[PDB]
Design a protein around this motif. Structure first.
Motif, PDB file in Angstrom:
ATOM      1  N   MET B   1     -56.028 -11.735  -8.255  1.00 43.84           N
ATOM      2  CA  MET B   1     -55.154 -10.593  -8.235  1.00 43.84           C
ATOM      3  C   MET B   1     -55.003  -9.924  -9.581  1.00 43.84           C
ATOM      4  O   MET B   1     -54.761 -10.585 -10.574  1.00 43.84           O
ATOM      5  CB  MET B   1     -53.742 -10.998  -7.779  1.00 43.84           C
ATOM      6  CG  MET B   1     -53.492 -11.057  -6.291  1.00 43.84           C
ATOM      7  SD  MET B   1     -54.131  -9.644  -5.395  1.00 43.84           S
ATOM      8  CE  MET B   1     -53.238  -8.304  -6.177  1.00 43.84           C
ATOM      9  N   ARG B   2     -55.108  -8.610  -9.594  1.00 42.82           N
ATOM     10  CA  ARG B   2     -54.884  -7.853 -10.797  1.00 42.82           C
ATOM     11  C   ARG B   2     -53.474  -8.047 -11.277  1.00 42.82           C
ATOM     12  O   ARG B   2     -53.221  -7.858 -12.440  1.00 42.82           O
ATOM     13  CB  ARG B   2     -55.151  -6.380 -10.504  1.00 42.82           C
ATOM     14  CG  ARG B   2     -55.020  -5.387 -11.634  1.00 42.82           C
ATOM     15  CD  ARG B   2     -54.977  -3.982 -11.061  1.00 42.82           C
ATOM     16  NE  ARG B   2     -56.225  -3.617 -10.402  1.00 42.82           N
ATOM     17  CZ  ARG B   2     -57.302  -3.144 -11.019  1.00 42.82           C
ATOM     18  NH1 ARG B   2     -57.312  -2.953 -12.329  1.00 42.82           N
ATOM     19  NH2 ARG B   2     -58.381  -2.853 -10.318  1.00 42.82           N
ATOM     20  N   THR B   3     -52.577  -8.437 -10.386  1.00 43.24           N
ATOM     21  CA  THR B   3     -51.168  -8.630 -10.705  1.00 43.24           C
ATOM     22  C   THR B   3     -50.893  -9.955 -11.403  1.00 43.24           C
ATOM     23  O   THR B   3     -49.767 -10.245 -11.739  1.00 43.24           O
ATOM     24  CB  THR B   3     -50.316  -8.546  -9.420  1.00 43.24           C
ATOM     25  OG1 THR B   3     -50.885  -9.362  -8.399  1.00 43.24           O
ATOM     26  CG2 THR B   3     -50.251  -7.106  -8.940  1.00 43.24           C
ATOM     27  N   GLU B   4     -51.925 -10.744 -11.592  1.00 43.68           N
ATOM     28  CA  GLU B   4     -51.809 -11.994 -12.288  1.00 43.68           C
ATOM     29  C   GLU B   4     -52.554 -11.914 -13.607  1.00 43.68           C
ATOM     30  O   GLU B   4     -53.662 -11.418 -13.673  1.00 43.68           O
ATOM     31  CB  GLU B   4     -52.329 -13.104 -11.413  1.00 43.68           C
ATOM     32  CG  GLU B   4     -51.350 -13.480 -10.317  1.00 43.68           C
ATOM     33  CD  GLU B   4     -50.046 -14.039 -10.866  1.00 43.68           C
ATOM     34  OE1 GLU B   4     -50.094 -14.968 -11.699  1.00 43.68           O
ATOM     35  OE2 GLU B   4     -48.970 -13.547 -10.477  1.00 43.68           O
ATOM     36  N   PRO B   5     -51.937 -12.405 -14.664  1.00 37.46           N
ATOM     37  CA  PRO B   5     -52.512 -12.251 -16.000  1.00 37.46           C
ATOM     38  C   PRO B   5     -53.749 -13.046 -16.296  1.00 37.46           C
ATOM     39  O   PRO B   5     -54.060 -14.009 -15.620  1.00 37.46           O
ATOM     40  CB  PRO B   5     -51.391 -12.750 -16.891  1.00 37.46           C
ATOM     41  CG  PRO B   5     -50.666 -13.739 -16.069  1.00 37.46           C
ATOM     42  CD  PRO B   5     -50.694 -13.188 -14.688  1.00 37.46           C
ATOM     43  N   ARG B   6     -54.469 -12.608 -17.308  1.00 32.01           N
ATOM     44  CA  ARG B   6     -55.653 -13.318 -17.713  1.00 32.01           C
ATOM     45  C   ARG B   6     -55.209 -14.603 -18.393  1.00 32.01           C
ATOM     46  O   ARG B   6     -54.324 -14.582 -19.220  1.00 32.01           O
ATOM     47  CB  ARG B   6     -56.501 -12.471 -18.634  1.00 32.01           C
ATOM     48  CG  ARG B   6     -57.893 -12.985 -18.889  1.00 32.01           C
ATOM     49  CD  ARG B   6     -58.753 -11.845 -19.388  1.00 32.01           C
ATOM     50  NE  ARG B   6     -60.026 -12.286 -19.947  1.00 32.01           N
ATOM     51  CZ  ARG B   6     -60.288 -12.441 -21.243  1.00 32.01           C
ATOM     52  NH1 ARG B   6     -59.372 -12.217 -22.172  1.00 32.01           N
ATOM     53  NH2 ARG B   6     -61.490 -12.841 -21.613  1.00 32.01           N
TER      54      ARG B   6
END
Lengths: 303, 7
Positions: B1-6
């Motif tokens: 998910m883009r909503t979860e950070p790298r």
């Protein structure tokens, strides 16, 4: 000039982090994707809710519109993309092939094709009518952050955490160019300018860059914002003054003057990271969306 | 998910 964006509406509805916001090419609607696995449509000018579309098994990281504002494509951690008829809310097709999360998606201008990027490090091109994968490009050595067609669909630009932006020939699948500056920070986003002459790229070192594709040179650099952990969407605002607009991990929307590289405005309102920004096709309107602690989309307007 | 950070 300087912009004077002001909040007009706050759109609430998603139950989890919002991932992407995109205005219809006709200017009437705004589509929104989320980790709650849904897509929602809203009125572009009033923010009035219109509908919810569902079917994905996992969260959605991106959504994109067809050129006639009739279809939408979505990309999910379920490793698939889906095409939807917006008027009915029905899934017309489910594109399968990626071996990992689909992160980015876009239709070409003719809208007979869809381009996709995945954490599987591939970029794929699909036939909208049949759902068939026409080509699979070994584009990168790391997750693909973004994918975008140029004005005539002859080219596709791609970005990755590998630190590279690459331009591809839609027809042949050949890599025509690889762009990189002095450093090799991960590339979190990329897009062609509306005239297709330039490319805007974001890197996870708090930097945005404007590139002349032909010359393979960086013309401008924009800083001031915070971006080191998330793939945030950025845009060219061309309805009024020429601006570069982006989200930021400090919960603000940043707006820069394209020529001077000065920050002209910082929009405050969100309570969490602004992951996505979208610029309206004809009016000076910006849509902004935020992560988990906020879950809202906001619509701003300027003279 | 883009909503979860790298990581």
């Amino acid at each position: 000039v300087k912009p004077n964006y002001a909040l007009k509406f706050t759109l609430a509805g998603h139950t989890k982090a919002v991932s992407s916001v995109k205005f219809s090419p006709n200017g009437e609607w705004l589509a929104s994707s989320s980790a709650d696995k849904l897509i929602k449509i809203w009125g572009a000018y009033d923010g009035k809710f219109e509908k919810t579309i569902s079917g994905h098994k996992l969260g959605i990281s991106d959504v994109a519109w067809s050129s006639d504002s009739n279809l939408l494509v979505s990309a999910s951690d379920d490793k698939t993309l889906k095409i939807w008829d917006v008027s009915s809310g029905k899934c017309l097709k489910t594109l399968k092939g990626h071996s990992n999360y689909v992160f980015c998606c876009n239709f070409n201008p003719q809208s007979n094709l869809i381009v996709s990027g995945s954490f599987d490090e591939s970029v794929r091109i699909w036939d909208v009518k049949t759902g068939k994968c026409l080509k699979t490009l070994p584009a990168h050595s790391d997750p693909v952050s973004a994918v975008h067609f140029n004005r005539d669909g002859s080219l596709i630009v791609s970005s990755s955490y590998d630190g590279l932006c690459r331009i591809w020939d839609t027809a042949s699948g050949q890599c025509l160019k690889t762009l990189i500056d002095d450093d090799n920070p991960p590339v979190s986003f990329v897009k062609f300018s509306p005239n297709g002459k330039y490319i805007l790229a974001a890197t996870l070192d708090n930097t945005l860059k404007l590139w002349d594709y032909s010359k393979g040179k960086c013309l401008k650099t924009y800083t001031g914002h915070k971006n080191e952990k998330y793939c945030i969407f950025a845009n060219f605002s061309v309805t009024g003054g020429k601006w570069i607009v982006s989200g930021s991990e400090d919960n603000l929307v940043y707006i820069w003057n394209l020529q001077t590289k000065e920050i002209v405005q910082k929009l405050q309102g969100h309570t969490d990271v602004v992951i996505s920004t979208a610029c309206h096709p004809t009016e000076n309107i910006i849509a902004s969306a935020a992560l988990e602690n906020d879950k809202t989309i906001k619509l701003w307007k300027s003279d | 998910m883009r909503t979860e950070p790298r990581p």
